[model samples]
Structures are given as structure tokens and as C-alpha cells.
Target: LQSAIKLEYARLVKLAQEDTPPETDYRLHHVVVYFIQNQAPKKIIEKTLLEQFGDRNLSFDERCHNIMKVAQAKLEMEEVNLEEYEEWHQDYRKFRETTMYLIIGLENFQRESYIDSLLFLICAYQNNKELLSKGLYRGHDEELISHYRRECLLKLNEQAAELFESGEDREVNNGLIIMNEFIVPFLPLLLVDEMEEKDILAVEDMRNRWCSYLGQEMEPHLQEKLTDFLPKLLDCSMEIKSFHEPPKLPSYSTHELCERFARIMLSLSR
Candidate 1:
């Protein structure tokens, strides 16, 4: 789609420049809108298409460049790996584990095992940081991994917000587990050197809520878990070593979380 789109637009631009200095290529634009609707429905909205390609200020060649870039980006977003991995293949461990976890993570999401899904996806994210950041698998892994991570985290975000805000004797409460298992472990995954611009407020809010429990009476087991995590978190075994020390400050940076964890345990130990 990218190559063809650019090639065709270049051809159009050539013709338009030869005859009509600035031709509006609405015909090609409208047709692609329909093509996307026909073949890849729900891929991208038409409004973005309009906003992107609708500018009259750009010359025909410039307009074609926009089409070229967006077409390539859209196609990239659409691609994802569906192949299964074989054992004993002897690929490097990081790549192997990253791909392995990606496949398993997506399947678990398909099976509605969202927790397991996020867990494995986080494994994929951590095992090989470059897997998503560098497009190691030509970005197919990046597409699926980032998308599913966002999907799962958004749901967890909502659930977490409610859990934190409504501090009550509510039945079916997994707030503590959400904090220990998923939140603390998975929060850093929300960003990549701040590459993706996930909300910073998310990390801020959860700490306030999770730590809220620290000052008050809590279950003995939960305290033990925090006690356990305090050492691990400070020791940098919370996740990847680099993760506990990200180049770009995370929305909820590990250092911040560490301090909060320290306070949680410090006062509790008191």
C-alpha cells in the first residue's frame, strides 16, 4: 500500500505539475477512504485522513509526501506476527523470550485471560527492550505488543481508579493484588523512554491510592508482601535493571515508586 500509494501519487504529482500547477487530488483521497472502508475497516478514521491530506497550502508533491508517510504508518500498524515459535531453535534468549511472551500474551488476551495476557506482554516488553523500541521484527511485534498493552492497561486503569477512589469494604476487591502484582510490576511499561506519551497522571494517582493504605492498618500478609517488595524494589530486582532506572523519567518513575515503597516499609517497620 505504501509503495503503490507513493508511486501513484508521484505519478499524479508529475502530471499535475506539468499541466495544473496545484491540482487537488481529492479523487485519489476519496477512493482510498473507500478502499480502507472496504478492505481494512476500523483501521483509521476518515477524519484523520481529511485533516492529514486536506491542506491546500502544501503543493501537490508535498501533499503526496503526507500520503506516503501516513500510508506507510497505517500499513505498519496493521502488520503483526501470527507465527508460532519452535523450541530448540537456538535464537538468542532475549529475542526468544520476547517473541515467545508476545505470542503467548496475545493468545491469553484472545482467551480473555487479560491478567495473564498483561503479565506475558510485560515479560515481552522487559526481556528485550529493543523489541518494541527498535522494531526488531520490522515493527510487527511493536504493533501488537504496544496495542494490547495499551488495551489491557486502560481497563486496569479504570478498575484501578475505582478501586483507589472508593476505599470501602467492597466485595470482589482485587485492589491490593492489582497494586502488588500488576501495578507495581507493570506501571513502568506504560512508556518507553517516554517514547509513546502515555498519561503521567496515571502513575501519580495510583501511588497516592496504594500508599494510602500504608499509613493505616492493613492485613498481615499484604504488609509482608510490601516488606518483601521493599528490599527487591530498592535492590533493583523489581523488573529489568534498566527499567528501575529508565533513561526518560517514567510517568510513574521507578525512583519515585521506590521512595514511596521505602516510606511504606520504613514507617511500617517502625
Candidate 2:
């Protein structure tokens, strides 16, 4: 059985690395890893498999499911001295929690429950910050979490606007609380390139309101960063507007030259 398993593993590795159709059967790979866990060569096989599939272009759903499977396998491992493996046990628990949160986050995002998705992702990041900071999960997971949070913040801003416009003092206060607690902390992670023109405007509007309400209560660095980035944000908004509404070109010779000069000055100021 060992010999046959090893041969199958070698074949699968070769096929995956060659970029063959179906790349690698991750499900089968998980099962093989389980079967070899108790064998003497378990570490060798596991290391080889991880190296081979580390860069495979698996979808987000697939990767999350695989992470859950690995976490479960860790839970089912044979008994060991608790004192000796305490740190390993703690690490595995953190990994399991993070994986579950990520899966839940993705599900909520798919269901259009952006706030719930944001909460779950924030929990995931907070739970595994040490591992993430150490590069154990690399940066892709961090980017995905930030992406979901940014989407949720944008969606929540729409809600906040409606609340404020309704003239309901109680609801506006609640919205402010949400922004200060959930949205503000993650604002720095939002990239200008990833946002639409409307999103930028919405965020800036919210930030202005928060400044008025919290006045001197907000962080200095946060305020300074926004101030610095505002120019670039305006530039992005205008660029996006131009794509939808092109400027008129002059018909006469000197007329075109005048328009060109104005455009050049505008671009330079931005």
C-alpha cells in the first residue's frame, strides 16, 4: 500500500507541475496526506506535496474548503504529550478559527450581507494576526480580507447616508457608532485604484461628517493621511467622469491650442 501510494503521489506531482488538464486533484491529495500521516515518511510526503501545489491557481472557495479540511485533520491527530505540543495545539486552534471565519465571510458576501461579511473577515484577521504578520499565510489572504471589508464599508456608507438624510437623530448616532468602530479602522486599507468614483465620494463625505461629530477625537495620523490622499482621490474621480463624458474638441486651429493649454494646466495641478 505504501509503495502504491508513493507511486501515485509522484505521478500526481508530475502532472500538476506540467500544467496538465485538471492540474491536481486537491481532494485526493488531502486524503493521501491523511493516509500517510502515521507513516514514517509522512513529513517528506507532506512537504513535497505542499511545495508542488503551493502556487496552484485554486479558486477562493476551493482554498477555503481545503483549509477547513487540513484543520480537521489536525484535530484528529494521534495523542501527544500536551505540554510538549502546547504551542502547536494553540497555533492549530487559531488556524481553524481563522479558516472558519473566512469561509463564513465569503458566504455572507455572496449572500449580499456585506456587513456580516465584514465582521467575519475582521474577526479572522484579528484571530490570526501573528501568523499573518509572520507571513505564514502570505499576503494574498490579507488582500482578500481587505477587499471584502472595503466593499462592506462602501455598502454601509449608503445606509449611513440614508439614515442621516431621514433626519432621525437616533439612527444617525447608531450609524456613527458603526463607522467609528467598524469602518474607520479599516479605511487605511482601502486602495484608491480599487474604488469607483462614487465610492470615493461616499467615503470622503462620511469622513467629513465623522470629523464634525468627533472633532479632535479622531486619530491625527488618520486625518493627515486622508488629507494627503484627497488630491489623488479627486483626480481619480475626474478621470472616471471623463471616460463617461468626453470633453469637446475644437474645430478651429487656434481654438484647439487654447483648449490643450487649459487641459495641460489642469492635469499638472491634479
Q: Candidate 1 on 215-251: residue-level lDDT in tens?
A: 7665665566445644432333335345343212124
Clashes of 1: 0
Q: Where does the lowest 10-residue lDDT sum fall in candidate 2?
A: 240-249
Clash count per candidate: 0, 0
Using Cα atoms with residue i matched to residue i, what is each candidate's TM-score against the true structure?
0.37, 0.43
Q: How does each model score on lDDT?
A: 0.45, 0.47
Candidate 2, residue 143: the lDDT equals: 52
Taking all chains together, the TM-score of candidate 2 against the true structure is: 0.43
- Which residues of candidate 2, in runs, are more than 4 Å off? 11-97, 125-143, 185-205, 209-270
Clashing pairs in 1: none
